[PDB]
Motif scaffolding. Structure first.
Motif, PDB file in Angstrom:
ATOM      1  N   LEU A  55       0.831  -1.197   0.000  1.00  0.00           N
ATOM      2  CA  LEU A  55       0.000   0.000   0.000  1.00  0.00           C
ATOM      3  C   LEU A  55       0.869   1.252   0.000  1.00  0.00           C
ATOM      4  CD1 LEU A  55      -2.792   1.474   0.540  1.00  0.00           C
ATOM      5  CD2 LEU A  55      -2.315   1.119   2.954  1.00  0.00           C
ATOM      6  N   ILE A  56       2.102   1.088   0.466  1.00  0.00           N
ATOM      7  CA  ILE A  56       3.085   2.162   0.532  1.00  0.00           C
ATOM      8  C   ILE A  56       3.340   2.908  -0.787  1.00  0.00           C
ATOM      9  CG2 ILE A  56       4.351   1.395   2.549  1.00  0.00           C
ATOM     10  CD1 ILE A  56       5.548   0.324  -0.839  1.00  0.00           C
ATOM     11  N   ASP A  57       3.062   2.281  -1.928  1.00  0.00           N
ATOM     12  CA  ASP A  57       3.280   2.955  -3.210  1.00  0.00           C
ATOM     13  C   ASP A  57       1.958   3.300  -3.888  1.00  0.00           C
ATOM     14  OD1 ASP A  57       2.344   0.518  -4.142  1.00  0.00           O
ATOM     15  OD2 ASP A  57       3.924   0.261  -5.631  1.00  0.00           O
ATOM     16  N   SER A  58       0.888   3.332  -3.100  1.00  0.00           N
ATOM     17  CA  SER A  58      -0.391   3.831  -3.577  1.00  0.00           C
ATOM     18  C   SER A  58      -0.698   5.152  -2.898  1.00  0.00           C
ATOM     19  CB  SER A  58      -1.503   2.818  -3.315  1.00  0.00           C
ATOM     20  OG  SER A  58      -1.273   1.616  -4.029  1.00  0.00           O
ATOM     21  N   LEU A  59       0.322   5.714  -2.254  1.00  0.00           N
ATOM     22  CA  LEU A  59       0.257   7.087  -1.779  1.00  0.00           C
ATOM     23  C   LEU A  59       0.082   8.027  -2.967  1.00  0.00           C
ATOM     24  CD1 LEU A  59       3.127   6.864   0.834  1.00  0.00           C
ATOM     25  CD2 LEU A  59       0.679   6.928   1.335  1.00  0.00           C
ATOM     26  N   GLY A  60       0.324   7.505  -4.170  1.00  0.00           N
ATOM     27  CA  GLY A  60       0.319   8.321  -5.367  1.00  0.00           C
ATOM     28  C   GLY A  60      -1.142   8.541  -5.674  1.00  0.00           C
TER      29      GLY A  60
ATOM     30  N   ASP B 141      11.266  -1.410   1.294  1.00  0.00           N
ATOM     31  CA  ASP B 141       9.839  -1.077   1.242  1.00  0.00           C
ATOM     32  C   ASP B 141       9.633   0.344   1.778  1.00  0.00           C
ATOM     33  OD1 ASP B 141       8.430  -3.294   0.009  1.00  0.00           O
ATOM     34  OD2 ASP B 141       8.964  -4.470   1.782  1.00  0.00           O
ATOM     35  N   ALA B 142      10.409   0.709   2.795  1.00  0.00           N
ATOM     36  CA  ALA B 142      10.383   2.052   3.374  1.00  0.00           C
ATOM     37  C   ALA B 142      10.817   3.034   2.281  1.00  0.00           C
ATOM     38  CB  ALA B 142      11.281   2.150   4.597  1.00  0.00           C
ATOM     39  N   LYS B 143      11.828   2.667   1.500  1.00  0.00           N
ATOM     40  CA  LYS B 143      12.277   3.485   0.363  1.00  0.00           C
ATOM     41  C   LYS B 143      11.128   3.639  -0.660  1.00  0.00           C
ATOM     42  CE  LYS B 143      15.082   5.728  -2.369  1.00  0.00           C
ATOM     43  NZ  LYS B 143      14.186   5.655  -3.554  1.00  0.00           N
ATOM     44  N   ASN B 144      10.403   2.554  -0.889  1.00  0.00           N
ATOM     45  CA  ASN B 144       9.245   2.575  -1.783  1.00  0.00           C
ATOM     46  C   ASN B 144       8.180   3.545  -1.222  1.00  0.00           C
ATOM     47  OD1 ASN B 144       9.124   0.655  -4.267  1.00  0.00           O
ATOM     48  ND2 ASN B 144      10.270  -0.505  -2.725  1.00  0.00           N
ATOM     49  N   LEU B 145       8.063   3.549   0.102  1.00  0.00           N
ATOM     50  CA  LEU B 145       7.186   4.412   0.904  1.00  0.00           C
ATOM     51  C   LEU B 145       7.612   5.862   0.655  1.00  0.00           C
ATOM     52  CD1 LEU B 145       5.051   4.952   3.124  1.00  0.00           C
ATOM     53  CD2 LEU B 145       6.729   4.266   4.831  1.00  0.00           C
ATOM     54  N   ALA B 146       8.924   6.027   0.552  1.00  0.00           N
ATOM     55  CA  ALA B 146       9.631   7.275   0.276  1.00  0.00           C
ATOM     56  C   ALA B 146       9.163   7.808  -1.086  1.00  0.00           C
ATOM     57  CB  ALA B 146      11.137   7.068   0.315  1.00  0.00           C
ATOM     58  N   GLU B 147       9.072   6.923  -2.075  1.00  0.00           N
ATOM     59  CA  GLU B 147       8.619   7.280  -3.435  1.00  0.00           C
ATOM     60  C   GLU B 147       7.216   7.906  -3.369  1.00  0.00           C
ATOM     61  OE1 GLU B 147      11.162   6.701  -5.750  1.00  0.00           O
ATOM     62  OE2 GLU B 147      11.939   6.186  -3.761  1.00  0.00           O
TER      63      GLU B 147
ATOM     64  N   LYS C 159      15.393  10.742   3.166  1.00  0.00           N
ATOM     65  CA  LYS C 159      15.921  11.151   1.863  1.00  0.00           C
ATOM     66  C   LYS C 159      14.763  11.715   1.037  1.00  0.00           C
ATOM     67  CE  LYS C 159      19.533  12.127  -0.316  1.00  0.00           C
ATOM     68  NZ  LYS C 159      20.668  12.795   0.380  1.00  0.00           N
ATOM     69  N   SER C 160      13.640  11.002   1.009  1.00  0.00           N
ATOM     70  CA  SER C 160      12.426  11.386   0.269  1.00  0.00           C
ATOM     71  C   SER C 160      11.906  12.729   0.776  1.00  0.00           C
ATOM     72  CB  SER C 160      11.335  10.345   0.400  1.00  0.00           C
ATOM     73  OG  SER C 160      10.186  10.722  -0.338  1.00  0.00           O
ATOM     74  N   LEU C 161      12.127  12.954   2.065  1.00  0.00           N
ATOM     75  CA  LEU C 161      11.744  14.176   2.765  1.00  0.00           C
ATOM     76  C   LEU C 161      12.608  15.282   2.193  1.00  0.00           C
ATOM     77  CD1 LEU C 161      11.531  13.052   6.528  1.00  0.00           C
ATOM     78  CD2 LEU C 161       9.676  13.168   4.891  1.00  0.00           C
ATOM     79  N   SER C 162      13.910  15.071   2.062  1.00  0.00           N
ATOM     80  CA  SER C 162      14.788  16.186   1.786  1.00  0.00           C
ATOM     81  C   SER C 162      15.024  16.294   0.285  1.00  0.00           C
ATOM     82  CB  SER C 162      16.127  15.971   2.483  1.00  0.00           C
ATOM     83  OG  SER C 162      16.557  14.640   2.283  1.00  0.00           O
ATOM     84  N   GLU C 163      14.425  15.355  -0.432  1.00  0.00           N
ATOM     85  CA  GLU C 163      14.483  15.248  -1.878  1.00  0.00           C
ATOM     86  C   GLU C 163      13.863  16.510  -2.462  1.00  0.00           C
ATOM     87  OE1 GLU C 163      13.244  11.558  -3.486  1.00  0.00           O
ATOM     88  OE2 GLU C 163      12.392  12.417  -5.317  1.00  0.00           O
ATOM     89  N   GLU C 164      12.746  16.887  -1.843  1.00  0.00           N
ATOM     90  CA  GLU C 164      11.837  17.919  -2.322  1.00  0.00           C
ATOM     91  C   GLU C 164      11.132  18.596  -1.144  1.00  0.00           C
ATOM     92  OE1 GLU C 164       9.074  16.467  -5.232  1.00  0.00           O
ATOM     93  OE2 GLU C 164       7.800  18.253  -5.110  1.00  0.00           O
ATOM     94  N   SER C 165      10.666  19.824  -1.354  1.00  0.00           N
ATOM     95  CA  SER C 165       9.886  20.537  -0.348  1.00  0.00           C
ATOM     96  C   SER C 165       8.585  19.802  -0.021  1.00  0.00           C
ATOM     97  CB  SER C 165       9.579  21.958  -0.822  1.00  0.00           C
ATOM     98  OG  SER C 165       8.731  21.942  -1.959  1.00  0.00           O
TER      99      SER C 165
END
Lengths: 350, 186
Positions: free
Chosen positions: A267-272, A291-297, A325-331
């Motif tokens: 479900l982590i990659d259906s945040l989209g 999976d956490a990285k996928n969560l990051a996506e 990383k996903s946090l600091s990737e973008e605002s």
């Protein structure tokens, strides 16, 4: 002389005093007089005390010492408690409405009097007096925010819906808590459906419902909008994740009893799809770092989110580093980020 | 043939071919009608020709619906219409300043209760409607629609009776709020 009568209201603090001789007193004032109880309604607006909080607790209505759907809406165990008697006011109010037989005359006041407030009912303790207010003014029900219902034992609620046949669409948010069900009559799910069509938003916590399995499908097909889903102490497979993803309208999402790492296609990659999630709380979840990285996506689409908490995540390793990383990737528009009781590095802080 | 002398048939408030299947190209009848609207305005009501797949003729029909005002009744009767279409026609209907009509006769189209659900989003503002019947040839069992109907029902005014011609469903505990008007299962 009337203001002298009014000065006798400088004697009294809110409904509060239901415990003593002046509680009922405004009732006695009203049975006594008509138009004049508008003056009474004026002091009902002069109420800032919210009644009294002693002996009352936001965790007495569900009868639980554990997280609810209402709990998913908040960061603490309590909050309604502070203004616990917001609906206590309403019972007094239906009686008061009734007492001067106050018809549509006292309505601007009552739309304003029960405003900013929520009412919560258990199915086990359903009063008969709620359809009472609905005498002359059922519509002003939409001064209130959410009418909350807990349904235990059996899905059998014809008595509950009868209320929502009397009121105008649509309630903003309508929330339901499911307890100790071993009879999920997929037929009576529908009555809950009737309750559900009353609201733009529907929030469900399914708790100790051993009759609830893939059958959550029935719960959803009838949902206009599954605005928030929390699941604990009930049968759960990974597939029910998809129901969570069918609803793009999702603001708040928790599940605190997985205890199992979330798959590759999780479900982590259906945040989209849930772009509207402003709040996510994941507690004591077993997960894969990758999976956490996928969560990051997922977080790029989570810019509309005001809150992200990931806590008591085990097996998370550097996955949390990745989320960061996903946090600091973008605002982000995030107002809250909790990284407690996960594996944190000085690097992740960097 | 009706078309050729129709300017003499202007005398008619009523030329009725409805509830009829024409042999071939029945829906193509409507293009003949677009040519005849100058005198079709003189009819007091709408009678449409129908056939198999007649609904595909609706855009052709839309030039004709600027003619909705001298209409006593309105329908897409025996039009085998897309389930979505009923709200679609509704959108034209939003764009349509006409008001008050007496009956909306939609003889059974292919539209489902779910279709009708889209349609409630238009039916509320047509509260000026006097009579109505909603038919379908194989209705969905769900009374969720009647419930949505109840949302619409507060919104409705001049209606004297609800007509349910052809709906094989139970209304459940929703029949408690089935209507604020009379009801026939047909």
């Amino acid at each position: 002389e009337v203001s002298k009568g009014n000065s006798y209201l400088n004697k009294m603090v809110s409904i509060s005093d239901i415990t003593s001789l002046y509680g009922n007193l405004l009732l006695y004032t009203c049975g006594s007089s008509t138009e004049a109880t508008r003056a009474v309604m004026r002091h009902l607006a002069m109420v800032y005390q919210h009644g009294s909080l002693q002996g009352l607790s936001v965790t007495k209505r569900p009868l639980w010492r554990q997280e609810s759907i209402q709990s998913l809406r908040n960061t603490t165990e309590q909050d309604v408690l502070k203004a616990i008697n917001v609906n206590s006011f309403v019972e007094c109010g239906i009686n008061l409405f009734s007492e001067s037989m106050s018809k549509s005359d006292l309505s601007q006041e009552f739309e304003a009097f029960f405003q900013g407030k929520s009412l919560y009912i258990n199915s086990e303790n359903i009063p008969d007096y709620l359809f009472d207010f609905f005498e002359y003014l059922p519509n002003c029900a939409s001064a209130l925010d959410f009418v909350k219902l807990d349904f235990y034992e059996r899905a059998t609620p014809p008595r509950a819906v009868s209320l929502f046949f009397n009121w105008k669409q649509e309630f903003k948010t309508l929330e339901v808590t499911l307890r100790d069900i071993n009879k999920l009559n997929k037929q009576d799910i529908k009555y809950l459906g009737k309750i559900f069509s009353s609201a733009t938003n529907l929030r469900l916590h399914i708790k100790r419902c051993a009759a609830m399995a893939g059958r959550l499908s029935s719960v959803l097909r009838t949902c206009k909008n599954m605005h928030t889903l929390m699941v604990e102490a009930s049968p759960l497979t990974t597939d029910d994740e998809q129901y969570i993803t069918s609803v793009t309208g999702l603001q708040n999402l928790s599940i605190h009893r997985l205890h199992t790492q979330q798959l590759p296609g999780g479900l982590i990659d259906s945040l989209g799809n849930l772009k509207n999630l402003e709040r996510l709380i994941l507690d004591d979840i077993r997960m894969n770092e990758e999976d956490a990285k996928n969560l990051a996506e997922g977080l790029r689409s989570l810019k509309k989110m005001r809150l992200l908490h990931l806590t008591h995540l085990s097996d998370i390793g550097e996955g949390m580093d990745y989320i960061v990383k996903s946090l600091s990737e973008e605002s982000c528009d995030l107002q809250e980020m909790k990284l407690v009781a996960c594996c944190l590095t000085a690097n992740s802080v960097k | 043939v009706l078309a050729q002398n129709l300017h003499n048939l202007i005398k008619l408030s009523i030329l009725d071919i409805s509830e009829n299947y024409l042999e071939k190209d029945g829906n193509e009848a409507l293009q003949e009608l677009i040519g005849r609207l100058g005198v079709l305005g003189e009819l007091t009501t709408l009678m449409l020709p129908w056939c198999w797949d007649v609904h595909t003729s609706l855009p052709k029909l839309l030039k004709q619906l600027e003619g909705t005002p001298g209409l006593a009744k309105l329908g897409l009767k025996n039009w085998r219409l897309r389930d979505e279409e009923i709200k679609s026609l509704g959108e034209f209907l939003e764009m349509n300043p006409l008001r008050d009509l007496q009956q909306l006769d939609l003889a059974g189209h292919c539209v489902s209760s779910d279709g009708w659900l889209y349609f409630m989003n238009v039916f509320e503002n047509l509260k000026q409607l006097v009579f109505f019947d909603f038919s379908t040839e194989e209705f969905l069992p769900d009374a969720a629609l009647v419930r949505k109907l109840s949302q619409v029902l507060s919104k409705l005014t001049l209606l004297q009776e609800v007509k349910l011609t052809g709906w094989e469903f139970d209304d459940y505990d929703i029949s408690a709020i089935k209507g604020t008007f009379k009801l026939v299962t047909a």
